[PDB]
Amino acid sequence: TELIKQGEQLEQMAQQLEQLKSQLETQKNMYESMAKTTNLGDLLGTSTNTLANNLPDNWKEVYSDAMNSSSSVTPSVNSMMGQFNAEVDDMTPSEAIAYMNKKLAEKGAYDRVMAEKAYNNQMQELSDMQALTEQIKSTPDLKSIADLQARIQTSQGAIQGEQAKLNLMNMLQQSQDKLLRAQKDRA
C-alpha cells in the first residue's frame, strides 16, 4: 500500500537534492559574476551623491520578495536593510537606489570570500543529505525519512530565498552600470 510507495517519495528526495545542488551551483557562479563587475565601489563618495539617473523600473516589488524571503544562503538581504517598507514607502526611486546600494555595500553583500564560505557550506550540507538518503533507503525508517524531508525543505527555502537576494542584487548592477555612465556625463 505504501511499502514501495515510500521508496518512491524517498527517490523523489534524492533527485531534489542533486537538483538543488544545481541551482546553488548557478547562484554561486552568478553571484561571483556580480561581485567581480560591480563598480559600486565608485559610487559611495560625495562626488556622486547627485548625478543620479534612473532605471529601478516598476518591478520594484523585487525588493519586496527579496526582503520577504524567510531564509537565504548568504546573509539575508532582510537584515541588510532597516525595514521592508522603508523603501516601498517614503523612499523615492533613485533615492532608494542610493539607499539600497549604501546598505548592500556597508554590509559586505559584495564580499565574495564570505559569500563563497556560505555557498560552499550549503553545497556540503546538500552532498551530505544525499549520502544520508542513500543510507536511509538501506535501513528505512519513518522518523529518518520525515526529518530528512523537513531538512531538505529548509535548504529549499534557503536556495529559493537566495534567488530573491540575487535578483535584487542584479537589478542593482543594472541601475548601477547606468548611474555610472551618467557620472561620465560632462567628460
C-alpha positions as a Python dict, from the first residue, in 0.01 Angstrom:
ca = {
    (1, 'T'): (0, 0, 0),
    (2, 'E'): (281, 238, 98),
    (3, 'L'): (574, -3, 141),
    (4, 'I'): (714, 56, -210),
    (5, 'K'): (531, 388, -220),
    (6, 'Q'): (785, 514, 35),
    (7, 'G'): (1087, 417, -171),
    (8, 'E'): (911, 648, -415),
    (9, 'Q'): (892, 969, -210),
    (10, 'L'): (1240, 875, -99),
    (11, 'E'): (1392, 870, -451),
    (12, 'Q'): (1198, 1189, -525),
    (13, 'M'): (1412, 1333, -244),
    (14, 'A'): (1748, 1210, -384),
    (15, 'Q'): (1653, 1393, -704),
    (16, 'Q'): (1552, 1710, -526),
    (17, 'L'): (1897, 1703, -373),
    (18, 'E'): (2102, 1667, -693),
    (19, 'Q'): (1864, 1921, -846),
    (20, 'L'): (1916, 2175, -560),
    (21, 'K'): (2291, 2124, -567),
    (22, 'S'): (2233, 2252, -919),
    (23, 'Q'): (2065, 2591, -860),
    (24, 'L'): (2320, 2656, -588),
    (25, 'E'): (2595, 2597, -843),
    (26, 'T'): (2430, 2861, -1061),
    (27, 'Q'): (2371, 3106, -776),
    (28, 'K'): (2729, 3065, -654),
    (29, 'N'): (2862, 3130, -1002),
    (30, 'M'): (2616, 3403, -1091),
    (31, 'Y'): (2678, 3582, -760),
    (32, 'E'): (3052, 3568, -832),
    (33, 'S'): (2971, 3726, -1166),
    (34, 'M'): (2843, 4039, -996),
    (35, 'A'): (3099, 4054, -713),
    (36, 'K'): (3350, 4079, -1000),
    (37, 'T'): (3188, 4359, -1207),
    (38, 'T'): (3010, 4585, -958),
    (39, 'N'): (3180, 4923, -990),
    (40, 'L'): (2962, 5018, -693),
    (41, 'G'): (3286, 5099, -513),
    (42, 'D'): (3295, 5409, -732),
    (43, 'L'): (2956, 5547, -626),
    (44, 'L'): (2977, 5568, -248),
    (45, 'G'): (3157, 5902, -247),
    (46, 'T'): (3037, 6260, -209),
    (47, 'S'): (3120, 6331, -575),
    (48, 'T'): (2846, 6102, -700),
    (49, 'N'): (2563, 6164, -449),
    (50, 'T'): (2368, 6357, -713),
    (51, 'L'): (2412, 6296, -1091),
    (52, 'A'): (2166, 6009, -1039),
    (53, 'N'): (1975, 5891, -1348),
    (54, 'N'): (1711, 5617, -1329),
    (55, 'L'): (1636, 5253, -1407),
    (56, 'P'): (1477, 5092, -1097),
    (57, 'D'): (1160, 5038, -1301),
    (58, 'N'): (813, 4918, -1196),
    (59, 'W'): (942, 4573, -1095),
    (60, 'K'): (1049, 4743, -767),
    (61, 'E'): (844, 4471, -597),
    (62, 'V'): (1155, 4263, -648),
    (63, 'Y'): (1271, 4449, -338),
    (64, 'S'): (968, 4313, -153),
    (65, 'D'): (1026, 3949, -249),
    (66, 'A'): (1394, 3983, -165),
    (67, 'M'): (1327, 4116, 185),
    (68, 'N'): (1035, 3877, 233),
    (69, 'S'): (1243, 3561, 186),
    (70, 'S'): (1206, 3363, 508),
    (71, 'S'): (1561, 3228, 451),
    (72, 'S'): (1869, 3262, 232),
    (73, 'V'): (2216, 3111, 197),
    (74, 'T'): (2428, 3419, 211),
    (75, 'P'): (2331, 3679, 478),
    (76, 'S'): (1962, 3768, 436),
    (77, 'V'): (1903, 4092, 246),
    (78, 'N'): (1631, 4117, 509),
    (79, 'S'): (1875, 4214, 781),
    (80, 'M'): (2088, 4421, 549),
    (81, 'M'): (1821, 4692, 524),
    (82, 'G'): (1645, 4889, 800),
    (83, 'Q'): (1288, 4794, 700),
    (84, 'F'): (1092, 4613, 423),
    (85, 'N'): (861, 4909, 357),
    (86, 'A'): (1119, 5177, 447),
    (87, 'E'): (1167, 5194, 70),
    (88, 'V'): (834, 5067, -67),
    (89, 'D'): (710, 5375, 120),
    (90, 'D'): (879, 5717, 167),
    (91, 'M'): (1197, 5630, -29),
    (92, 'T'): (1166, 5776, -381),
    (93, 'P'): (1312, 5582, -677),
    (94, 'S'): (1678, 5676, -733),
    (95, 'E'): (1664, 5798, -372),
    (96, 'A'): (1606, 5437, -263),
    (97, 'I'): (1869, 5303, -506),
    (98, 'A'): (2139, 5502, -332),
    (99, 'Y'): (1984, 5379, -8),
    (100, 'M'): (1976, 5013, -112),
    (101, 'N'): (2330, 5047, -251),
    (102, 'K'): (2477, 5211, 60),
    (103, 'K'): (2347, 4922, 275),
    (104, 'L'): (2448, 4636, 47),
    (105, 'A'): (2795, 4788, 40),
    (106, 'E'): (2825, 4859, 411),
    (107, 'K'): (2708, 4503, 483),
    (108, 'G'): (2958, 4315, 268),
    (109, 'A'): (2698, 4193, 20),
    (110, 'Y'): (2988, 4209, -227),
    (111, 'D'): (3247, 4030, -14),
    (112, 'R'): (3284, 3714, -218),
    (113, 'V'): (3512, 3529, 21),
    (114, 'M'): (3237, 3534, 284),
    (115, 'A'): (2982, 3466, 7),
    (116, 'E'): (3178, 3160, -108),
    (117, 'K'): (3203, 3039, 250),
    (118, 'A'): (2824, 3037, 286),
    (119, 'Y'): (2780, 2895, -61),
    (120, 'N'): (3028, 2614, -6),
    (121, 'N'): (2880, 2529, 333),
    (122, 'Q'): (2534, 2474, 180),
    (123, 'M'): (2684, 2275, -106),
    (124, 'Q'): (2840, 2041, 154),
    (125, 'E'): (2519, 2017, 357),
    (126, 'L'): (2345, 1903, 36),
    (127, 'S'): (2606, 1647, -59),
    (128, 'D'): (2572, 1516, 292),
    (129, 'M'): (2194, 1499, 282),
    (130, 'Q'): (2247, 1294, -35),
    (131, 'A'): (2473, 1037, 125),
    (132, 'L'): (2214, 1031, 402),
    (133, 'T'): (1926, 949, 163),
    (134, 'E'): (2129, 654, 42),
    (135, 'Q'): (2193, 529, 394),
    (136, 'I'): (1822, 563, 476),
    (137, 'K'): (1697, 353, 184),
    (138, 'S'): (1906, 58, 309),
    (139, 'T'): (1766, 75, 661),
    (140, 'P'): (1444, 275, 609),
    (141, 'D'): (1262, 440, 894),
    (142, 'L'): (966, 678, 915),
    (143, 'K'): (1132, 924, 1151),
    (144, 'S'): (1452, 935, 950),
    (145, 'I'): (1257, 1000, 633),
    (146, 'A'): (1041, 1270, 797),
    (147, 'D'): (1341, 1452, 937),
    (148, 'L'): (1543, 1435, 619),
    (149, 'Q'): (1230, 1564, 443),
    (150, 'A'): (1196, 1875, 666),
    (151, 'R'): (1573, 1910, 649),
    (152, 'I'): (1561, 1921, 267),
    (153, 'Q'): (1269, 2162, 275),
    (154, 'T'): (1481, 2404, 477),
    (155, 'S'): (1752, 2412, 212),
    (156, 'Q'): (1471, 2458, -37),
    (157, 'G'): (1378, 2787, 125),
    (158, 'A'): (1738, 2894, 156),
    (159, 'I'): (1815, 2836, -212),
    (160, 'Q'): (1492, 2998, -323),
    (161, 'G'): (1528, 3291, -82),
    (162, 'E'): (1882, 3324, -217),
    (163, 'Q'): (1738, 3384, -566),
    (164, 'A'): (1543, 3688, -446),
    (165, 'K'): (1858, 3845, -297),
    (166, 'L'): (2031, 3782, -627),
    (167, 'N'): (1758, 3927, -847),
    (168, 'L'): (1757, 4237, -633),
    (169, 'M'): (2136, 4227, -642),
    (170, 'N'): (2130, 4201, -1021),
    (171, 'M'): (1864, 4468, -1057),
    (172, 'L'): (2110, 4691, -876),
    (173, 'Q'): (2405, 4605, -1102),
    (174, 'Q'): (2172, 4729, -1378),
    (175, 'S'): (2069, 5056, -1211),
    (176, 'Q'): (2442, 5077, -1119),
    (177, 'D'): (2611, 5047, -1459),
    (178, 'K'): (2356, 5311, -1568),
    (179, 'L'): (2419, 5555, -1282),
    (180, 'L'): (2787, 5510, -1377),
    (181, 'R'): (2778, 5625, -1740),
    (182, 'A'): (2553, 5902, -1606),
    (183, 'Q'): (2851, 6016, -1397),
    (184, 'K'): (3067, 6033, -1710),
    (185, 'D'): (2812, 6295, -1825),
    (186, 'R'): (3028, 6600, -1899),
    (187, 'A'): (3362, 6428, -1966),
}
